[PDB]
Amino acid sequence: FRSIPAITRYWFAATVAVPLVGKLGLISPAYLFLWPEAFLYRFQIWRPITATFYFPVGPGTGFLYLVNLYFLYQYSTRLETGAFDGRPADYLFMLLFNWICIVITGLAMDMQLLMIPLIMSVLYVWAQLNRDMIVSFWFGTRFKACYLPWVILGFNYIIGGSVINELIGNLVGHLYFFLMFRYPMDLGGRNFLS
Amino acid sequence: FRSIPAITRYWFAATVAVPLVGKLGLISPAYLFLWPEAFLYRFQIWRPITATFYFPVGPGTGFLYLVNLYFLYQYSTRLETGAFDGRPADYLFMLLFNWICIVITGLAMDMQLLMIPLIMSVLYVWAQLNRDMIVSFWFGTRFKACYLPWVILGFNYIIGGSVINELIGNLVGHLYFFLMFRYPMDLGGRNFLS
Amino acid sequence: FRSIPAITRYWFAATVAVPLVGKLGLISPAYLFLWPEAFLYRFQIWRPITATFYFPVGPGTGFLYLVNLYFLYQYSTRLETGAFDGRPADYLFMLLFNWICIVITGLAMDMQLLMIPLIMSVLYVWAQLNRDMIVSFWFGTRFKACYLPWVILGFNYIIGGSVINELIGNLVGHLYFFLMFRYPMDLGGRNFLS
Amino acid sequence: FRSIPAITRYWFAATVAVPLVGKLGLISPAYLFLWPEAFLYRFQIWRPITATFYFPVGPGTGFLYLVNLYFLYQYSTRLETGAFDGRPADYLFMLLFNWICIVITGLAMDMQLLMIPLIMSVLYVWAQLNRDMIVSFWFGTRFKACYLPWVILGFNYIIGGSVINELIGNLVGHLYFFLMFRYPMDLGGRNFLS
Numbered sequence: 001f002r003s004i005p006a007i008t009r010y011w012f013a014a015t016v017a018v019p020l021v022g023k024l025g026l027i028s029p030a031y032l033f034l035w036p037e038a039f040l041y042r043f044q045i046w047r048p049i050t051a052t053f054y055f056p057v058g059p060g061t062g063f064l065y066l067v068n069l070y071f072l073y074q075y076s077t078r079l080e081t082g083a084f085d086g087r088p089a090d091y092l093f094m095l096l097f098n099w100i101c102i103v104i105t106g107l108a109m110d111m112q113l114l115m116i117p118l119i120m121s122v123l124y125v126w127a128q129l130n131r132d133m134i135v136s137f138w139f140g141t142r143f144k145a146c147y148l149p150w151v152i153l154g155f156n157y158i159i160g161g162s163v164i165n166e167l168i169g170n171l172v173g174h175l176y177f178f179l180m181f182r183y184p185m186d187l188g189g190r191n192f193l194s
Numbered sequence: 195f196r197s198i199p200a201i202t203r204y205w206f207a208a209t210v211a212v213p214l215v216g217k218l219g220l221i222s223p224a225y226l227f228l229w230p231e232a233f234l235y236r237f238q239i240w241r242p243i244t245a246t247f248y249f250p251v252g253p254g255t256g257f258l259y260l261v262n263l264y265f266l267y268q269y270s271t272r273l274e275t276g277a278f279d280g281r282p283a284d285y286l287f288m289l290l291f292n293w294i295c296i297v298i299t300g301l302a303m304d305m306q307l308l309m310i311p312l313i314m315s316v317l318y319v320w321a322q323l324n325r326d327m328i329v330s331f332w333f334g335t336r337f338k339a340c341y342l343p344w345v346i347l348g349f350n351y352i353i354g355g356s357v358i359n360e361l362i363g364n365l366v367g368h369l370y371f372f373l374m375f376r377y378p379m380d381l382g383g384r385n386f387l388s
Numbered sequence: 389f390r391s392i393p394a395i396t397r398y399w400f401a402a403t404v405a406v407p408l409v410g411k412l413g414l415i416s417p418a419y420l421f422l423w424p425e426a427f428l429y430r431f432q433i434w435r436p437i438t439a440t441f442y443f444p445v446g447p448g449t450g451f452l453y454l455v456n457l458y459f460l461y462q463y464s465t466r467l468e469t470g471a472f473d474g475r476p477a478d479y480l481f482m483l484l485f486n487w488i489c490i491v492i493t494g495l496a497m498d499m500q501l502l503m504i505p506l507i508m509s510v511l512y513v514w515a516q517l518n519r520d521m522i523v524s525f526w527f528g529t530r531f532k533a534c535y536l537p538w539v540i541l542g543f544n545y546i547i548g549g550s551v552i553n554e555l556i557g558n559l560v561g562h563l564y565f566f567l568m569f570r571y572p573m574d575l576g577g578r579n580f581l582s
Numbered sequence: 583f584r585s586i587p588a589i590t591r592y593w594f595a596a597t598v599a600v601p602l603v604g605k606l607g608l609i610s611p612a613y614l615f616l617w618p619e620a621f622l623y624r625f626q627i628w629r630p631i632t633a634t635f636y637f638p639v640g641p642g643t644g645f646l647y648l649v650n651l652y653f654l655y656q657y658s659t660r661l662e663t664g665a666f667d668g669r670p671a672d673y674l675f676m677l678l679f680n681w682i683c684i685v686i687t688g689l690a691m692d693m694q695l696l697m698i699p700l701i702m703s704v705l706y707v708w709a710q711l712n713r714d715m716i717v718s719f720w721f722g723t724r725f726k727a728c729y730l731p732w733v734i735l736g737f738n739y740i741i742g743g744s745v746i747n748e749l750i751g752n753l754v755g756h757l758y759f760f761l762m763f764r765y766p767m768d769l770g771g772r773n774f775l776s
Contacts, residue, residue, distance in 0.1 A: 024357055060254060062352045157648075160641040163605060217551060253548040260545075412745055448642060450740045 005073075006080035007088055008095075012073055015115070018053045019065075029056065033112050034103075048103050052114045064116075072119050075126050083129065086194065093188045095122070098172045105168055117169030124149045124173035149173075200271040201282050202289075209263065209309065212247045223250060228308065230301045242297055246308045258354045265346060266313045273320045283386035288319070288374075292366050299362055310350065311363025318343045318367035343367075393461075394468035395476055396483075400461060403503070406441045407453075417444065421500050436491055440502045456507055463511050471517065474582065481576045483510070486560045493556055505557030512537045512561035537561075588659040589670050590677075597651065597697065600635045611638060616696065618689045630685055634696040646742045653734060654701045661708045671774035676707070676762075680754050687750050698738065699751025706731045706755035711763075 002009070022029050034051035038044050055065050084091045098121045106114055127146040136143035149170045153163055179186050196203075216223050228245035232238060251259045278285055292315045300308050321340045330337040337345070347360050374380060390397070410417050422439035426432050443453050472479045486509045494502055515534040524531035537558045541551055567574050584591075604611050616633035620626060639647045666673055680703045688696050709728045718725040725733075735748050762768060 020357075023351075057351075059353065059355050066352060157639060157644060160639075160644050163602070164607065214551070219552065251545060251548070256546060256548050408745075411739075445739075447741065447743050454740060 006077045014053045019055055019057055022054055023057055036107050055115045068119055071123055075123050089188055089192050089194055097176055101172045102168060116165045120149055120166045121169035121173045124170045128177050200274045206267055208247050213249055213251055227306050248307060249309050262310055262313055269317050269320050277323055283388045284382050287382045292370055295366050305359050311359050314360050315363040315367040318364050322371045394465045402441045407443055407445055410442055411445055424495050443503045459511055460507050463514050477576055477580055477582055486564055489560050490556060504553045508537055508554045509557035509561045512558045516565050588662045594655055596635050601637055601639055615694050636695060637697050650698055650701055657705050657708050671776045672770050675770045680758055683754050693747050699747050702731060702748055703751045703755040706752050710759045
């Protein structure tokens with residue numbers, strides 16, 4: 001939807017374009033998995049940037065991708081109209097921070113598809129920046145907010161799935177919230193353009 | 195109701211019937227795949243024609259069959275009633291022409307079940323000659339014209355499998371449209387039952 | 389529900405009791421499969437009576453059993469209050485007829501769990517004896533009757549499954565309906581007790 | 583709400599927590615199975631107690647965990663509030679006594695995850711002394727007393743797996759019921775924190 005929705009729609013364009021160049025057969029998808037065993041000794045700088053945008057699509061894994069893209073579009077732009085309003089280098093620094101933390105803890109783990117925890121992290125930091133909102137749902141129209149990433153884990157226990165793909169992002173959101181709210185000197189750097 | 199709504203609904207009857215012969219267990223489904231290299235060395239003229247009358251319904255690929263068959267019935271007779279009330283022989287020639295090229299481009303590539311791209315070919319050919327009609331869905335009535343091939347491509351991309359097979363059907367549909375509504379000497383064949 | 393619902397509840401008691409003696413581990417269920425290869429040369433008179441009452445239960449095949457037992461209790465007792473009203477040797481002769489026919493045609497096939505087609509057969513003969521009933525459903529509250537066993541096949545194509553477990557019963561129901569309605573001399577025999 | 587609703591909800595906290603340790607990937611689930619013959623030769627006192635605090639949630643056995651945990655929380659504190667407002671030490675002795683016999687009858691048989699039968703043991707002990715209460719379900723309010731163990735056995739029989747695990751839990755519940763409400767000299771132990 002290129003009709004000026006926000007400033008950072010390049011992310012949404014990348015996450016809709018890269019599985020289309022993966023699935024069609026231009027590049028064999030074996031080169032996009034973020035292998036830490038191939039990142040330890042061999043340098044191979046392709047993976048930790050090409051893995052955060054690619055998601056594999058299969059006939060049976062085709063609703064997680066759609067609902068994660070919906071979470072991305074619907075909950076990143078609310079910060080774009082509510083928190084990104086001016087000084088956008090600050091919130092680009094926010095989005096880089098949990099990026100580098102979750103890629104280094106995915107090297108600490110053995111997780112290989114790094115697209116879910118970043119969106120879960122930005123969803124949790126949305127819900128934590130907007131505590132005490134009376135409406136959060138449409139069936140149970142009254143809902144206590146900020147519990148949404150845990151309700152995502154509840155729907156994961158309904159679908160079975162796994163929880164290792166989400167709780168690291170849901171913890172790094174609390175990490176950034178603590179280092180922002182509690183203590184100062186978590187400021188940006190050079191290359192300011194605003 | 196099978197009250198002969200159009201002159202060529204034996205296509206619909208056969209594309210319902212032959213998958214019941216497949217799933218019933220009379221002939222093995224491995225005999226109906228259009229193995230192209232087995233069509234190359236061996237003669238085997240059993241399978242350029244039965245491959246486009248087959249779809250392996252079962253555990254998981256069940257909604258795709260119903261949606262594509264519904265779109266086939268829903269738009270074939272509407273193509274017949276719109277700007278095709280006469281000349282049924284030229285309509286049969288149209289239904290032959292995209293087939294005799296899609297069998298070649300499917301023989302070069304590695305596609306097996308050529309049921310979906312021919313249905314989206316005739317849907318695309320309907321889309322080119324039916325501009326400004328907006329009433330498409332019962333719920334989504336705001337769908338603009340010549341967008342429905344891309345959204346059924348999106349449905350086959352999310353629920354189904356590959357994407358390279360439907361794009362070549364759109365390509366051969368555009369090929370027939372340009373070669374039929376711009377240039378002469380493509381009338382049809384003799385001994386037509388017009 | 390032993391509270392006098394009908395006359396032939398012995399069938400329902402058998403079909404609720406035999407999977408409980410199978411699943412608990414008293415008898416290894418390898419002796420209950422109706423092997424025609426063990427019925428051809430070896431006599432082995434256990435199988436074609438012990439296989440028509442036993443149904444295997446697994447965590448994931450646990451709704452077909454419940455819905456088939458519901459079809460049994462709901463649609464056999466309707467004949468008990470509508471067609472079995474007196475002279476019950478006639479309808480015992482009905483229930484034994486399609487029993488031995490689907491036994492001999494399951495020997496003609498290789499199908500091994502003989503519980504579904506008998507209930508589908510008696511459901512189809514119910515719907516055929518009650519042609520021109522205005523109500524047949526609750527969501528689409530107007531429904532043309534006797535299409536119910538084909539709607540069961542439609543829900544099978546939704547669930548994927550297989551249609552060889554139902555169409556032989558749905559055909560033997562039409563066989564009995566033809567041999568009852570069209571021609572005489574399909575009468576019972578001795579051991580009358582009514 | 584964790585507002586300490588009863589004195590022994592650490593059971594509930596642990597039976598929620600330890601499956602997250604299992605599904606998280608810290609300790610392998612093969613170390614927590616109560617292999618009885620491996621408990622026979624080897625000492626291995628890691629596994630009489632961790633086996634009754636575990637359930638392998640995931641792809642397929644997900645609703646059984648939620649329903650059984652809901653029944654545990656819903657009836658443990660209601661047993662505590664009904665005829666057990668005093669004497670918590672005898673309640674703890676009750677929660678020990680069925681365990682120290684179910685570990686023996688599970689060691690003789692081949693059961694692994696002793697979470698379900700202890701919950702239905704305490705549910706059956708509740709049902710045995712709570713006659714004539716009819717209001718049980720929010721929809722099915724006509725459920726008579728001392729029938730709920732059989733219907734949760736039916737739920738575990740249809741959705742879950744085996745049936746031999748729950749009957750010995752009902753048996754040891756009846757054993758404790760008769761041996762506690764008829765015969766003396768089973769008071770408890772010294773150093774009780776009453």
